[PDB]
Amino acid sequence: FMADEYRYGVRSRCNVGFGFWQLAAMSTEELNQVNFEKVYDAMRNQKADGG
Amino acid sequence: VDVYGNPIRTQQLREPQTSRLAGLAKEFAQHPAKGLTPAKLARILVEAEQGNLQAQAELFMDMEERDAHLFAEMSKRKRAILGLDWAVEPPRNASAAEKADADYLHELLLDLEGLEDLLLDALDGIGHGYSCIELEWALQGREWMPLAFHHRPQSWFQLNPEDQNELRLRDNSPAGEALQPFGWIIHRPRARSGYVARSGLFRVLAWPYLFRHYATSDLAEMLEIYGLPIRLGKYPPGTADEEKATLLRAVTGLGHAAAGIIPETMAIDFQQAAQGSSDPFLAMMRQSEDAISKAVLGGTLTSTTSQSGGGAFALGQVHNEVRHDLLASDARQLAATLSRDLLWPLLVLNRPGSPDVRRAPRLVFDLREQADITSMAQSIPALVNVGLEIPSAWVYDKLGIPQPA
Amino acid sequence: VDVYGNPIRTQQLREPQTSRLAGLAKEFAQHPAKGLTPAKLARILVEAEQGNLQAQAELFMDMEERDAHLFAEMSKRKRAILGLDWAVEPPRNASAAEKADADYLHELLLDLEGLEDLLLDALDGIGHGYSCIELEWALQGREWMPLAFHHRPQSWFQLNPEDQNELRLRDNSPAGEALQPFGWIIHRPRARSGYVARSGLFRVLAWPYLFRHYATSDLAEMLEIYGLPIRLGKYPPGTADEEKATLLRAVTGLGHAAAGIIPETMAIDFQQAAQGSSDPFLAMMRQSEDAISKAVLGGTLTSTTSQSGGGAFALGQVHNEVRHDLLASDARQLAATLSRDLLWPLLVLNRPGSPDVRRAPRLVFDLREQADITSMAQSIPALVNVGLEIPSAWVYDKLGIPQPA
């Protein structure tokens, strides 16, 4: 008995995602913005062709 | 929209749903009835319960083809419906617009070729538990028309993994494909309460069919062995291979050959071949056939036959109990399915406005039973002379005579 | 064009489609019924399911010829239709032009020789599952005429590899040849829902035929062996070849010869030849014949015979259930096929304009059942004296008496 699939994943855009987190929530920012806000502001200011 | 409320888009009506599934049209039935044992039948039924309807459908087709008694019963039952007159009636206390809509639908059904074939194809669901007929939609200007009705094999569908009462097409995916709205006329008669897989009559009739098949095959084999007796030749030590072959051929042909001679040192013993009767086999066949007759048409006229005997009330006696009940049930279920699937798309495509679903016209089969004209014609004059004011509408309706126009 | 919408070209009507296939007319049936075993029959049916209809058609022809009971049943069923009066009626609420067209078509069918043969040839599709009749078109000035009707053997066709419901001629190519429009009258009655290959009644009747054939052959063999007993002679060592031959001839002729003498050193033993009865064989034959009767004509009058018993309602009792249903089904299917294939070309070739397909006249068979004149004639006077205004049209139509002109 078997099931078949013909799909595959995709990598839509690597300029709209981020990884490699040293996640933690000890201090208001000094440990929260370590990753959460770095991703947030980086994406907020990611530049494209034409600056 | 449809009766179930699902959104309806006229774009998808130009092509059949199965057109993009050219793989289905090239398939051939696997004939699972050949070499069928009780264990195989049990496995087939259990697998069908779990959503594998292909094997069950093919087995049912083989069962229908290979049994003459079952086929005759089913054909008689379906032809009973196929011969009934039908009419389209407007809803309760309908208005002039509703009456016009019902009249137009009635005229359209009268002039629609292939209605009898559609009814025959739909009635297959009685035995198979569900019948699907694909629609071909065409536009002759501004009015949609059903170009043709195509009956698709039950082996083309399956069960939804998330729902055991919802059928889906086999599109090579685990979940199948949902049925297109307005693209099918699905008939699912309900003899027993349960899921769609268990709802077929052939599921009830399978075991008697297997019993009869085994009995008939065994009887045929025993008739083949009957006739001459088995006779065994014995030879002494020192008989060469050529003499052994000669003795073997002599024994083989001895039954057909009246006479033969062997040395006194040899011996031939005639042993019983097959001694008994056909009584057990025939008893089993009769039991199975009676079971099939009772299950299909009732145990009052077919299995335990009602016997002869005429009379004015003979029609009622033969019909009302059993036969009338079955006829009315089948006709009503078929009419409900038709009114749901074919009448509604015509009303909501071929006419303006959005009439309420509860007020849609309903197809009605003529279940009127012939009433004794002579007895009742004798009866009326006494009642009317007494003083009773019997309406003429009741008389005209019950006798079948139409009202004057 | 035709009913199916395929373009129609009058150029191809001058010659039959099969004229350029002179190879077909020189073929001879292979008679696959001789030496038929259950395995061979199963292979034949399975191959037919896959598009090899030649062997199936030849087997069906042999089956029809070699079984007297089956042949009698089929002939009776077909002769039932052949004896029905028929008429051509105009469409619903037809106009004067439509009435004239219907009248002209009716006159043309009345004066068309070979109609009965056409109906007989078409009815072969009941057992074979499909019947094809080739048309000969001729021009007697400005009006096309069917010169003759030619019935072509079912062995001349096959299934489309890309479509299991579409028949094609055998032109030595894998895909065959599509049927010419207006060149054939294809009759495909539908006893069971399915593909064309599986739709024949002989497919249902094949197995009982084989059972009966085996039983009859075995009974004939056992009757041949019956009579004298098998008797075996034994001789001592030192018997020469001449004495052996003399003993063998003596044993061979001993059954016919009342008396004989042998040396005390020899011995003759009379062994049982075939001891039993015809009961098993005859039981099997009766079972098969009952199955055939039920499958062909219903299990109320033929197999389980309705027995005697007259009366005013005896006609209804014998007919309405089973016999009337089967008669009406066959007549309606034949009428639909005829109206589709023969009436339409005549209307669209022999008359001007392009009438809409939905308004074409339809051939109707007279299924009117004889109604008791005496009882109803007693009944009317009471009803009319009561006050009911029964229309005279209903009376004239139901009694069979024509309206005054």
- Render the burial of B76-101: b for 16+ CB within 10 Å, e for the rest: bbbbbbbbbebebebbeeeeeebeeb
C interface test, pick of B155, B223, B386 with most C CB neighbours within 10 Å: B223
- Tell me which amino acid residue B132 is: C
Q: Which residues of C touch B61 (CB under 8 A)?
A: 194, 198
Distance CA(B256)–CA(A17), nearest Å, equals: 93
Task: Out of C193, C287, C311, name the one closest to residue B120 (CB).
Answer: C193
Distance CA(B71)–CA(B212), nearest Å, equals: 14
Cα radius of gyration rounded to whole Å, chain C: 31
**Are the beta carbons of C228 and B381 separated by less than 8 Å?**
no
Q: Among residues B307, B76, B23, B210, which one has the least CA distance to residue C307?
A: B307
B partners (3+ CB pairs within 8 A) are C
Cα radius of gyration rounded to whole Å, chain A: 18
Residue C399 has which token pair? Answer: 């009694």
Phi, psi of B329 (to 5 degrees): -60, -50
Distance CA(C262)–CA(C264), nearest Å, equals: 6
Q: Are strands B131-139 and B144-152 parallel, antiparallel or unpaired?
A: antiparallel
Distance CA(B326)–CA(B319), nearest Å, equals: 10
Cα radius of gyration rounded to whole Å, chain B: 31
Distance CA(C281)–CA(C36), nearest Å, equals: 19
Mind giving me the DSSP string for B279-305? HHHHHHHHHHHHHHHHHHH-TTTTSS-
Task: Out of B68, B282, B395, name the one closest to residue C388 (CB).
Answer: B395
**Are the beta carbons of B28 and C50 separated by less than 8 Å?**
yes
Query: In Å, how far is B162's CA from the nearest CA of chain C?
Result: 30
Q: Are strands C177-178 and C163-169 parallel, antiparallel or unpaired?
A: antiparallel
The helix-helix angle for B68-82 and C325-338 (nearest 10°) equals: 70
The SS3 of residue B194 is: coil
Distance CA(C207)–CA(C70), nearest Å, equals: 12
Residue C81 has which token pair? Answer: 């239709």
Distance CA(C250)–CA(C231), nearest Å, equals: 11
| Contact criterion met (CB below 8 Å) for C56 and C157 | no
| Contact criterion met (CB below 8 Å) for C9 and C348 | no
- Three-state SS across C204-264? HHHHHHHHHHHHHHHHHHHHHHCCCCEEEEEECCCCCHHHHHHHHHHHHHHCCCCCCCCCC
Distance between start and end Cα atoms, chain B: 39
- Render the burial of C207-220: b for 16+ CB within 10 Å, e for the rest: bbbbbbbbbbebbe
The helix-helix angle for B68-82 and B325-338 (nearest 10°) equals: 70
Query: Taking CA B277 as the corner, what is the angle to CA C41 and CA B255, rounded to the nearest 5 degrees?
Result: 70
The SS3 of residue B108 is: helix
Secondary structure E strands in B192-318: 230-234, 259-263, 267-271
| Residues 6 or more apart whose Cβ sits within 8 Å of residue B42 | none
According to DSSP, residue C127 is labeled H
Q: Is the dihedral of CA B375, B377, B382, B388 positive or negative?
A: positive
Q: How many CB atoms lie within 10 A of CB C178?
A: 13
Distance CA(B66)–CA(B333), nearest Å, equals: 28
Q: Among residues C199, C212, C220, C284, which one has the least CA distance to residue C36?
A: C212
Q: How many CB atoms lie within 10 A of CB C358?
A: 14
Phi, psi of C8 (to 5 degrees): -115, 130
Q: Are strands B177-178 and B163-169 parallel, antiparallel or unpaired?
A: antiparallel
Q: Are strands C157-160 and C163-169 parallel, antiparallel or unpaired?
A: antiparallel
- Phi/psi region, residue B28 (left: phi>0; alpha: psi -120 to 50; beta: rest), is beta
**Are the beta carbons of B131 and C298 separated by less than 8 Å?**
no
Q: Which residues of C touch B83 (CB under 8 A)?
A: 324-325, 328-329
State the residue for tokens 């350029």.
C20
Distance between start and end Cα atoms, chain A: 55
C interface test, pick of B31, B61, B66, B75 with most C CB neighbours within 10 Å: B75
Distance CA(B145)–CA(B135), nearest Å, equals: 10
Query: In Å, how far is C392's CA from the nearest CA of chain B?
Result: 10
Q: Among residues C135, C175, C100, which one has the least CA distance to residue C342?
A: C135
| Residues 6 or more apart whose Cβ sits within 8 Å of residue B301 | B318, B322, B323
Distance CA(C67)–CA(C201), nearest Å, equals: 15
Q: How was this structure determined?
A: cryo-EM
Residue C380 has which token pair? Answer: 């009317």
Query: Taking CA C11 as the corner, what is the angle to CA C8 and CA C15, rounded to the nearest 5 degrees?
Result: 110
Distance CA(B143)–CA(B68), nearest Å, equals: 45
Residue C354 has which token pair? Answer: 């392009």
Query: Taking CA B204 as the corner, what is the angle to CA B202 and CA B205, rounded to the nearest 5 degrees?
Result: 60
The SS3 of residue C270 is: strand
The SS3 of residue C165 is: strand
**Are the beta carbons of B261 and C247 separated by less than 8 Å?**
yes
Distance CA(C73)–CA(C204), nearest Å, equals: 14
